[PDB]
Write a protein that binds this DNA or RNA. Structure first.
Lengths: 88, 259, 104, 117, 66, 70
RNA sequence: CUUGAGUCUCGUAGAGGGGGGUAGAAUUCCAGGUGUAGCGGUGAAAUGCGUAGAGAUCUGGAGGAAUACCGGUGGCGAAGGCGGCCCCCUGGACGAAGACUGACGCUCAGGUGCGAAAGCGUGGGGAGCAAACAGGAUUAGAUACCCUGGUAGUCCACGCCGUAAACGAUGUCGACUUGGAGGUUGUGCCCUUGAGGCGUGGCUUCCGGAGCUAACGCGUUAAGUCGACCGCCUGGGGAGUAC
């Protein structure tokens, strides 16, 4: 999993209040970081299918979040995707 | 109203769970079943053998009051565990009384050691004690007139498992079971144990502070196979048994009774 | 970083060498700002079964809060070192500073 | 032959045939006998009696060695297990230790398939 | 009638050999939770400890082996 | 099941003790079990079936017991 | 807006997954010692192995595969499945309080992935077991059952295959409707006066009420009472076959 400190850092940056944590953008960021982390793992361990399932799920969740953001507020979404470097 | 609610907490206040409050009035006697009513959901099917004192005949007619015991409720229909154990608490209280003045005095008469301590009997009950407790010194009651009258001065008690060895004559003188399972071990230490349930292959006498013994069917008597242990001994009775075998690992102490 | 608990068993003919080895091990741990919370020479001890034909061996317990690289290094050292017969580096949640039941 | 006071009796008890082997304490076999050797075949040699007689034979064979003390090591499942040791006792050795030495794997090799009868 | 619930231990220790020895057979085997009456959670832990001990030659795998 | 004959112990008694030890071990039983390969499925089936049987013995029979036979 | 859905904090149990180490038992083989005529096998035999010294027994070595006891109608996993011990990387679940986000949800044709065993490809490995095969029995025959051997395979790596009574023969998600006896895993209070007492959550085994059902049975984990979405059925054979 993502280390506590790292998570906190992520929250602080993206979250407006820094106590917020549940902001859509923040959540997305958290997901993204985790995904990035797991890439390294999965390069090594290609047959770790069970673990990869979780990763996939996370990705899906992130996508959903992004979609939600888009309909609600476009500018914010755009900003987020610039920050994280998500192609979509 | 709240008359009933208050009456309920009142009746909670004026009873307790063990055999403590001498409340059941004997409301029908018939051999071989006594029956009381201690303010419980049903009447006890009492044996007659929890109530005859020291020579075999009954002592209590209608209206008489002994407490029984509790904490076990409904096996189908009925209410209690027997009042005779009740009695054990009273015995414990008298034994405890010693502590106050460092000397409990009654009569103790101990002729011989089943397992290394003369047996002492107080009133109806007879207890077994470790070998030293019977005599203050090396006097030995084997030379004393048989089943002699002294008292009991306590030598040793095991405090969890109930074994008490007491001091005859010499008036002037004044996790837990299984780590150290070497006390009753060595080959044949006789014990006094109440049987619990006879499982048609066994009898399950088990007394010594949270253990399990069997005395299964092969010994029990001096007939092997046709015996059926319910016919031959009892239910709920303190008997002659000794270890013959301990496994401290697969907790099976395999006692015997043919001795 | 991560609280490990190590018990290694030395060959009984190398019992006089043990302290030096222990010192060396400690030193390495210290190097990477690693703490060493307890350390207990259990000494010569009768084995329950004869490992590598010998019946006694010299047990050393050692609890360490160190980074995993150093642990790895230690393990490697153990494996190649012929004095140490068995080892058992073994993770733990807390520091566990209080003494072992066989020392007490 | 050198006489020896103390030794081992190894009792290999199979379902089909019992084999008794008296040896010195070090491992070197002194004598042996079998239920198949004792004049029993098929149904007969897979019995306690057969085992006993094998044991007896074995005992007889190691008379010259002059063995008084004896530790028994019992291997495998069979009829020839209790009987054999009794026989040995009768033959007149002081039985010192009675050990079971059945090879029980800690789940290792796959056994052969189950018979369809 | 579990010991570890009453003692209230956080984790069973493989080093505490004496304790382990109560739960192991004369033949070396780990004793069932029916017989000892150990709680399920603790039982597993105990087993693990025993295994660890066996690896460290503190307890024997079996009576016969040498 | 390693055993040593005690000083002035009878042979028969010793034998009996040994037998008891063996029984405790469950060595013979174990041997029997490992004679032939049991498919995992079969093993599972036996275990569950046995359990079911045990359950039946415990509860249904108890229920029966409540009512008298004659 | 916060009740659904999710995020954060602290713990919890776990054969969940991937990778790398290691331990002990047992089988097999090799070398040697002791020892002497049987061993082995079956319903009974024989083939087979044995005086070229087997079987038995002890010592040393090699190598592979699997993990006794714990172990449980126990646990984890979407299913397939997962079981010695240790470490590294890693996914999910649950509880405790709070704090936050503010319907972000449910279902899903096509699509994508994972998917026992056997099977295939290339390269390794090969102890035990064992399709095929061989011999010995049995038999009217015995291309079987039983016995003695025994090669693919089982094991590892990376690909493919894409099916199983892949079953709870029961799609997924949500809500609601009497009870009892357990198991397991949290957690709040209570003199833990003791292994307990009173609750409150998660997962789970059995019995049974109303209701439902052709009956058998299911029964708060529904096969009850309803809603949302999808999948599928339309007499047996021909056929899950042909093109």
């Amino acid at each position: 999993s993502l280390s506590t400190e790292a998570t906190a850092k992520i929250v602080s940056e993206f979250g407006r209040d820094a106590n917020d944590t549940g902001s859509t953008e923040v959540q997305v960021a958290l997901l993204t970081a985790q995904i990035n982390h797991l890439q390294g793992h999965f390069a090594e361990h290609k047959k770790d299918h069970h673990s990869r399932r979780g990763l996939l799920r996370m990705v899906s969740q992130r996508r959903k979040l992004l979609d939600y953001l888009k309909r609600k507020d476009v500018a914010r979404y755009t900003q987020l995707i610039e920050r994280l470097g998500l192609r979509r | 109203e709240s008359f009933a609610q208050l009456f309920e907490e009142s009746l909670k206040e004026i009873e307790t769970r063990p055999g403590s409050i001498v409340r059941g009035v004997v409301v029908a006697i018939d051999k071989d079943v006594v029956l009381v009513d201690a303010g419980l959901k049903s009447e006890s099917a009492i044996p007659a053998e929890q109530f005859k004192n020291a020579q075999g005949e009954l002592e209590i007619q209608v209206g008489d009051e002994v407490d029984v015991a509790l904490d076990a409720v409904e096996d189908g229909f009925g209410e209690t565990l027997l009042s005779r154990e009740k009695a054990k608490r009273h015995e414990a209280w008298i034994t405890l009384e010693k502590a106050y003045e460092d000397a409990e005095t009654v009569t103790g008469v101990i002729n011989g050691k089943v397992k290394g301590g003369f047996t002492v009997e107080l009133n109806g009950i007879r207890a077994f004690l470790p070998g030293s407790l019977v005599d203050v010194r090396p006097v030995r009651d084997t030379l004393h007139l048989e089943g002699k009258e002294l008292e009991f001065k306590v030598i040793k008690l095991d405090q969890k498992r109930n074994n008490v060895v007491v001091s005859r004559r010499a008036v002037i003188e004044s996790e837990d079971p299984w780590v150290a399972i070497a006390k009753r071990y060595p080959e044949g230490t006789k014990l006094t144990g109440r049987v619990t349930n006879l499982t048609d292959y066994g009898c399950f006498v088990e007394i010594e502070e949270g253990v399990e013994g069997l005395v299964h069917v092969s010994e029990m008597d001096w007939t092997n196979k046709n015996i059926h242990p319910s016919k031959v001994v009892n239910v709920g009775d303190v008997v002659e048994v000794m270890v013959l075998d301990i496994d401290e690992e697969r907790r099976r102490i395999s006692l015997g009774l043919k001795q | 970083m991560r609280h490990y608990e190590i018990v290694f068993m030395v060959h009984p003919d190398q019992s006089e060498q043990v302290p030096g080895m222990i010192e060396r091990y400690t030193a390495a741990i210290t190097g990477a700002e690693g703490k060493i919370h307890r350390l207990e020479d259990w000494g010569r001890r009768q084995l329950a079964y004869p490992i590598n034909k010998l019946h006694k061996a010299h047990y050393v317990l050692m609890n360490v809060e160190a980074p995993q690289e150093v642990i790895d290094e230690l393990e490697t050292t153990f494996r190649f070192n012929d004095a140490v017969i068995r080892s058992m580096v073994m993770r733990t949640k807390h520091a566990v500073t209080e003494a072992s039941p066989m020392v007490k | 032959r050198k006489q020896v006071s103390d030794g081992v009796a190894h009792i290999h008890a199979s379902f089909n045939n019992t084999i008794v082997t008296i040896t010195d304490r070090q491992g070197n076999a002194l004598g042996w006998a079998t239920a198949g050797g004792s004049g029993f075949r098929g149904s007969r040699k897979s019995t306690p009696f057969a085992a006993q007689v094998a044991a007896e034979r074995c005992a007889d064979a190691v008379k010259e060695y002059g063995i008084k003390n004896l530790e028994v090591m019992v291997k495998g499942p069979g009829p020839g297990r209790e009987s054999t040791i009794r026989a040995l006792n009768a033959a007149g050795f002081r039985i010192t230790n009675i050990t079971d030495v059945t090879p029980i794997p800690h789940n290792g090799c796959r056994p052969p398939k189950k018979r369809r009868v | 009638f579990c010991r570890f619930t009453a003692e209230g231990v956080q984790e069973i220790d493989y080093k505490d050999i004496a304790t382990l020895k109560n739960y192991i057979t004369e033949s070396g085997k780990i004793v069932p939770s029916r017989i000892t009456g150990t709680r399920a959670k603790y039982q597993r832990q105990l087993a693990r400890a025993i295994k660890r001990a066996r690896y460290l030659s503190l307890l024997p795998y079996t009576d016969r082996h040498q | 099941p390693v055993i040593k004959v005690r000083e002035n112990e009878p042979f028969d008694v010793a034998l009996r003790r040994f037998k008891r030890s063996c029984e405790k071990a469950g060595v013979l039983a174990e041997v029997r079990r490992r004679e032939f390969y049991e498919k995992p499925t079969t093993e599972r089936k036996r275990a569950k079936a046995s359990a079911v049987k045990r359950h039946a013995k415990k509860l249904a029979r108890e229920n029966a017991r409540r009512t008298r036979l004659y």
